[PDB]
Design a protein around this ligand. Structure first.
Ligand SMILES: *[C@@H]1O[C@H](CO)[C@@H](O[C@@H]2O[C@H](CO)[C@@H](O[C@@H]3O[C@H](CO)[C@@H](O)[C@H](O)[C@@H]3O)[C@H](O)[C@H]2NC(C)=O)[C@H](O)[C@H]1NC(C)=O
Ligand SMILES: *[C@@H]1O[C@H](CO)[C@@H](O[C@@H]2O[C@H](CO)[C@@H](O[C@@H]3O[C@H](CO)[C@@H](O)[C@H](O)[C@@H]3O)[C@H](O)[C@H]2NC(C)=O)[C@H](O)[C@H]1NC(C)=O
Ligand SMILES: *[C@@H]1O[C@H](CO)[C@@H](O[C@@H]2O[C@H](CO)[C@@H](O[C@@H]3O[C@H](CO)[C@@H](O)[C@H](O)[C@@H]3O)[C@H](O)[C@H]2NC(C)=O)[C@H](O)[C@H]1NC(C)=O
Ligand SMILES: *[C@@H]1O[C@H](CO)[C@@H](O[C@@H]2O[C@H](CO)[C@@H](O)[C@H](O)[C@H]2NC(C)=O)[C@H](O)[C@H]1NC(C)=O
Ligand SMILES: *[C@@H]1O[C@H](CO)[C@@H](O[C@@H]2O[C@H](CO)[C@@H](O)[C@H](O)[C@H]2NC(C)=O)[C@H](O)[C@H]1NC(C)=O
Ligand SMILES: *[C@@H]1O[C@H](CO)[C@@H](O[C@@H]2O[C@H](CO)[C@@H](O)[C@H](O)[C@H]2NC(C)=O)[C@H](O)[C@H]1NC(C)=O
Ligand SMILES: *[C@@H]1O[C@H](CO)[C@@H](O)[C@H](O)[C@H]1NC(C)=O
Ligand SMILES: *[C@@H]1O[C@H](CO)[C@@H](O)[C@H](O)[C@H]1NC(C)=O
Ligand SMILES: *[C@@H]1O[C@H](CO)[C@@H](O)[C@H](O)[C@H]1NC(C)=O
Ligand SMILES: *[C@@H]1O[C@H](CO)[C@@H](O)[C@H](O)[C@H]1NC(C)=O
Ligand SMILES: *[C@@H]1O[C@H](CO)[C@@H](O)[C@H](O)[C@H]1NC(C)=O
Ligand SMILES: *[C@@H]1O[C@H](CO)[C@@H](O)[C@H](O)[C@H]1NC(C)=O
Lengths: 308, 87, 87, 87, 308, 308
């Protein structure tokens, strides 16, 4: 047979041969909307994962939450003490792979030092505030004594600990906040030990302040022991985080949420996975087809069209 | 009648064959960067660019060969029927 | 008799061809880590996983195509002999 | 006469097809080191060696398949003409 | 037809089949000469790119120059203050990608400090000299005061700044050159800040000197501000460099120059790009074919040769 | 012809076609035993390569040995001074690529300092001991003078030097062991120089001790000179190691040894290399086939089975 309108396709023999029918396997575009079935989607509208972990006052709603794919809108921003995340991508991908916020409190002993320090740059309401998961340690009266907190792990899983080192602006600020002229904080496990010394200096004035905080994290295995030694400029944890293993990731997006049931999520929306290839994006999540650079992969589905 | 259903079996087997999932990834290397970091940026971007290029190549010859086989079969049966009509 | 020895020559050439060594390695990247190190672990594991996946793919189409050619030849000679028997 | 010009069209299309540029690079990873630096040297050399090996492989089957198709067509027309001469 | 002399080719069916004709697509060798059309070729005979940037006395000819592909002969060598380039490849590839030497001077204010220091190891003629783009800052009379210089960016492009930190050999040299017993230099932008402290010690005596200089670079975006703070051992810039985007690269070569017009340049000379594959080298520039490991890729261009 | 029992194989045409015969090219498993022909196999039963290099008392048998493929059993363990290998994989792969233990002694001069220090944590027999290739330098009487040792290379090959820096637990320990309140050790060649300063602090008590040792290595080329400067906390070498170039590697295994002659060794045992592909493991040594993820690659070796 023959038809008056064929379809032109690419070959190795000739660049464009005409056959009676073809197919368009490549997915061309997305619907624009991301939707949360069967995945568990949590919308971090104005705060990213790290701000949810520290406990920013404007995102205290996200507590003890789980998720399957966290989203990060471009409108996210911080409203607390200025900070820096040394090797930010590693900890971001680590916390993103867990997918939970099960924070288990722990009883700590801080002798001779004043806890729960706050600043007006992190007002949790009408008064001064701080982070929910961290505690600012300060001197009491006339001294800041040396600390040596020990915590064991009698469980059968891993624990995550977060802590911070305070960098003052002037030496007078350091001396008035910690009687010690110089600071030093050592974290230690039976196999991993680290030591941090603060850096006095001027930083770009952000939100009306030049002092800084540097955050670090530690992982404790079953049977391991965590020891903390300090003499000044330490932000101590209030507990720990339980580690899990699962299919959890992150994806920066700005698309609205819908109710469709779909296993393929892209930053530009959702797409059906009934096709072998797509050209919407490389960065995908879940069961999503191969990424390519060609949007016009045609597959001849009929005999050669030789009209009369 | 036999040729139509035969070719249908051909392309439908080809389709339900090539549409297989062989890719499974949860978290990958950071493609985007905001600033210049150093040699590690070169390593990252180079490996991922080579990966995407090689995957595109694989796809290219996949479609090329499958289309070629469809041609071979369709033009073969075409000359066969032309022969049996021009006895 | 001719077809049997011909096909034997075919598969034996194919065999002594595909069994070639083209891989030579003395010491490679670390495939196994005891703790979490950072981004370098991602780089290492990703490049080696992409390598093994691509090699498996290469092997896949190697066997696919060679088996395909063996089919084409065997069914071709099959219809040829069926024709010469059904004169 | 028809077979000669037909085969000429075949190989000339094949030629002006396969000679395409699909590679564009301005500056790449360091392929040459003067001293021993550490793990980053392993990452660099391994990724570039895997790249060159995979490209050589791609080239290998490219020529293999194209030569195969040229064979199939030339020996097909050969037996066809032998048949029409040995009527 | 048949010919008495065929051509043997590799196949998958049989390892060597004889046909009537074949072709030799792989480019086998180069002419040995590199030539500068339509590309703009500049010959760095005895000084590499970095020495052209610092302004070595023996290559003051290369000033305010542009190029399309810079060459680096193996006979290059330095004739000035010994130095070290921390992360040399990054800055080399960065400056190589620009392709210009548009150096725009800037008015700087250095209060209380003596500028334009030189040494006999960099004689620009009959007397002592220094780098053309750098200025050695020294004490004046009895002190080296702290410096806090600021420079804005009111333009719509990026600026490159180069600076250096001086490592003396002895503490007496440091004290006599800078009254401060210890040095510190901080570069800062609104998003990037770095701090360097000199290292007093003995180095391998090169050209009759043990003191060293460490070079660093900074990029300033439109609307950004560059602040420099110092208390000793600082080599300040005299201006900046404008950044561009184009097709500029580098290639180490020792081949002579010719007048051919060719789009493919290799370290072993030039080659025509009328072929799909070549085996001369993998490092190419411009429109150059695929690199392979096989120099004998034959393509059968005729029927099977079956002689009588 | 036709047979009543064919073999099903995978194709691109149909997923399972039946032919008269097929083959099973993929190697399916290993014999479980590794065996030492024609390779030279040395069994590091309870001590790895690094412990063989330092000279642990429990593995003094492995001295001046050569090998082709060193094995590391999971039962390995150390019985000496606690240590840390900065960038362990690099030095491990470097020493593994050599394959020899030719240790050539060298005459060193240590003025004013007491050598051959030992501790009860490394008892080589009934009394206190230390490493065989290292020497612990200590003060003599009332001082630990500065050391500046020099060693040339008049040969035509490379030399490997190992050294260590001692990290005490308390400042009193440092002062009693080295009169200098702070330590510093500089290694230097004509092109490579490094400097290490000890770190006083508490470490996880291992084998009843908190002090630590950090090992470093240096390579000396023909015509190069190695200079060592020290003022405290230095563990000096007793000689050097000759570098070679050959086919030497390492493989962690727990399989017993046999007397087979085979060119392919895997951690799970030996396998014949008469096949193009295998699925036992990716990590191989010597002439070993391609690694894949499919154990059922069938190759049709007969005509299509069409029974009567
Ligand atoms: C050394 O040079 C730097 C570079 O300018 C100086 O940093 C500047 O310090 C001033 C402090 O007066 C900052 O001005 C601030 O502006 C805000 C907004 O009006 C105002 O609320 C603050 O009270 C303050 O005036 C200025 O932003 C800052 N420049 C940069 C780069 O941010 C630094 O002060 C100099 N050292 C000395 C001697 O101060
Ligand atoms: C510790 O021992 C090493 C090795 O002997 C010393 O290195 C060498 O030290 C001498 C004396 O400083 C250097 O000689 C110098 O030559 C230059 C150039 O002519 C001259 O300007 C200096 O005044 C001196 O005469 C020698 O070059 C150097 N090794 C090298 C670079 O090859 C090291 O100095 C000793 N410890 C000290 C003193 O720091
Ligand atoms: C701060 O707290 C940590 C954790 O409790 C202290 O570390 C512990 O110090 C004790 C000192 O007796 C260690 O005990 C010793 O263990 C070694 C094991 O080789 C043994 O040989 C000694 O006889 C003794 O039993 C203990 O192991 C060590 N670690 C833990 C987890 O307890 C640290 O000393 C404290 N620092 C201070 C006092 O500020
Ligand atoms: C899938 O999402 C991406 C995320 O933005 C979309 O992105 C870009 O596409 C535009 C259109 O040409 C480009 O100009 C941008 O450079 C792309 N951003 C990149 C590559 O980071 C993309 O369009 C979406 N897919 C579809 C089919 O719309
Ligand atoms: C292209 O330029 C390169 C640059 O030197 C030439 O290089 C080498 O070729 C010789 C000849 O066998 C080898 O011994 C060297 O090891 C090569 N150097 C390398 C790989 O860095 C090359 O010969 C030139 N191409 C041609 C066709 O002459
Ligand atoms: C080759 O040696 C490896 C080394 O252990 C064997 O390893 C594993 O195989 C088991 C069986 O499924 C898996 O559960 C493990 O996860 C494997 N270990 C890995 C991947 O590190 C392997 O079985 C041996 N080959 C054969 C054919 O037995
Ligand atoms: C294109 O094909 C469609 C599908 O049959 C047909 O309706 C239409 O008339 C064709 N147009 C032309 C210009 O052939
Ligand atoms: C062409 O193929 C598509 C499926 O690929 C099918 O839906 C369509 O009906 C076919 N065209 C005709 C005219 O049958
Ligand atoms: C090889 O081929 C050339 C080209 O026709 C011919 O002149 C020559 O005689 C041939 N040599 C042999 C030995 O066949
Ligand atoms: C063989 O082919 C080449 C081009 O590939 C051509 O120049 C040559 O003339 C051909 N040989 C003959 C005998 O025509
Ligand atoms: C399977 O093949 C073997 C080999 O000839 C034969 O002995 C056996 O009877 C066959 N079994 C069946 C069920 O066909
Ligand atoms: C099938 O092939 C194998 C070799 O692949 C051979 O050993 C066996 O004898 C063959 N089967 C028959 C029935 O000949």
């Amino acid at each position: 047979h023959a038809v008056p309108n064929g379809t032109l396709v690419k070959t190795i023999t000739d660049d464009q041969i005409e056959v009676t029918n073809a197919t368009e396997l490549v997915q061309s575009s997305s619907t624009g909307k991301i939707c949360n079935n069967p995945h568990r989607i949590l919308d971090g509208i104005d705060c990213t994962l790290i701000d949810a972990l520290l406990g920013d006052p404007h995102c205290d709603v996200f507590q003890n939450e789980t998720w399957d794919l966290f989203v990060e809108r471009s409108k996210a921003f911080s409203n607390c003490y200025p900070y820096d995340v040394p090797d930010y991508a590693s900890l971001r991908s680590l916390v993103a792979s867990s997918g939970t916020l099960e924070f288990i409190t722990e009883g700590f002993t801080w002798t001779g030092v004043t806890q729960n320090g706050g600043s007006n740059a992190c007002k949790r309401g009408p008064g001064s505030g701080f982070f929910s998961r961290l505690n600012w340690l300060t001197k009491s009266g006339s001294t800041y004594p040396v600390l040596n907190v020990t915590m064991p792990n009698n469980d059968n899983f891993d624990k995550l600990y977060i802590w911070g080192i305070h960098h003052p602006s002037t030496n007078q600020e350091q001396t008035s906040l910690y009687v010690q002229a110089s600071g030093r904080v050592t974290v230690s496990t039976r196999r991993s030990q680290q030591t941090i010394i603060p850096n006095i200096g001027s930083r770009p004035w952000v939100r009306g302040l030049s002092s800084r905080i540097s955050i670090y994290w530690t992982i404790v295995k079953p049977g391991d022991v965590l020891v903390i030694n300090s003499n000044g400029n330490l932000i101590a944890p209030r507990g720990y985080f339980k580690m899990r293993t699962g299919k959890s990731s992150i994806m920066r997006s700005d698309a609205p949420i819908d109710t469709c049931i779909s296993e393929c999520i892209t930053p530009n929306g959702s797409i059906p996975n009934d096709k072998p290839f797509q050209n919407v994006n490389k960065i995908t999540y879940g069961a999503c087809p191969k990424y390519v650079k060609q949007n016009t992969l045609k597959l001849a589905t009929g005999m050669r069209n030789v009209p009369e | 009648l036999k040729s139509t259903q035969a070719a249908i079996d051909q392309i439908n087997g080809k389709l339900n064959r090539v549409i297989e999932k062989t890719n499974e990834k949860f978290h990958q290397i950071e493609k985007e960067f905001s600033e210049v970091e150093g040699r590690i940026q070169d390593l990252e971007k180079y490996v991922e660019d080579t990966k995407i290029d090689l995957w595109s190549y694989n796809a290219e010859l996949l479609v090329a060969l499958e289309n070629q086989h469809t041609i071979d079969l369709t033009d073969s049966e075409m000359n066969k029927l032309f022969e049996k009509t021009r006895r």
